[PDB]
Structures are given as C-alpha cells and as structure tokens.
Design a protein around this nucleic acid. Structure first.
Length: 117
RNA sequence: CAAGCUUGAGUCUCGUAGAGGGGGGUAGAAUUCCAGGUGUAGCGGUGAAAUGCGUAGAGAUCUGGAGGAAUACCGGUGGCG
C-alpha cells in the first residue's frame, strides 16, 4: 500500500451491471466495486444510482493509496456511464481525461439471435 | 430465285465507371481460448429468477501468444451481374 497519485478508473457499464475498477497507470488493479456487490440485485442493479454508489465504494477501496489525479475509461452501453464519473468527481478526485473505449468489431464475430420477447 | 442498299444486327480505333467472376497474398478492430502480473467476492442472466462460472481466485484490468470467421466508418429507394 504505497502512494500512486496517478490512477485510471475503468468503468465497465454493462446493461445488467456496472463494474468500477481503479488501477495504476500500468494496469494493475488496486480496488474495485460493483453495483451488485453494493446491495442491489435484479432491477435495482442496472440503475445509475447503483453505479453511483458503486463508484463511491470503489473510491473508498483506494483511500490507502492516496490518488489525486486519475483517468476515466468508460466502456459499455449500460447505465452508469456518466453517473460513475460524477460519483468519482464528487469523491475528491481530479478527473484529468475521460475516454470511451467501448469495443467495436469491424464486422467480426456473429452476435446472438434476436430475442422474441 | 438473282443482284443490290444501310437504317436492324455485328467488327475495329480511343477512353470511362463498377461489391461482375476465378486464384494468391496481406491488414486492423473484435469474440473465444492458453500462460502470467495486479486484485477480491462476486460475476453472468432475467419481467423476476434459477441453471451456469467463482475463494482450487471468477468477473475487472494489464502483457504475450494461438486460431477461425467476417470485413465498422466509406455506405447512399448507390453500382455491377
């Protein structure tokens, strides 16, 4: 548990959940928190409020590392794309960059079939 | 039947556009898998769940590798056959 002061907030904003992982510049994870692990199951898990409290709890899992400036890498179409960024900025964090890294295949693999719901 | 004619039908000259066809090569993004680092209790999924994966360390993230398939943007009641 040494001091970093330079982190990256990897937000995995899926349709069903939101996973926030704070790593250093190299990519080694220091702490993480999810919407499902913050007391939300089912319908409450895929909400911007659950993502916000997950970003709040993940920012507390790295208080021993003393991060002052951290990057934001958003990935996924689900809710909590901007809610986690707001919850990270409100937690006393200097957001230096925000980046969308959602994977886009250049017409690669075949996706599953449509749901006849 | 015989001889014609050039307007139908073709040949030649010079260019133009095109996912037209057959063969070979190669590029990047992504999925999956394998090995390793960080890291910890969830992940995944749904109307809600459960089956399923996960403390034998999953999911997340980072690095390297393997393999196959299809070619985002261009891209368009656009083009060729």
């Amino acid at each position: 548990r040494k001091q970093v002061s330079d982190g990256v907030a990897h937000i995995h904003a899926s349709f069903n959940n939101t996973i926030v992982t704070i790593t250093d510049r190299q990519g080694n994870a220091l702490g993480w928190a999810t919407a499902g692990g913050s007391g939300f199951r089912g319908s409450r898990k895929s909400t911007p409020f659950a993502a916000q409290v997950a970003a709040e709890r993940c920012a507390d899992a790295v208080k021993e590392y003393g991060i002052k400036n951290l990057e934001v890498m958003v990935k996924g179409p689900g809710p909590g794309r901007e809610s986690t960024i707001r919850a990270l900025n409100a937690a006393g964090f200097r957001i230096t960059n925000i980046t969308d890294v959602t994977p886009i295949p250049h017409n690669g693999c075949r996706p599953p079939k449509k749901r006849r719901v």
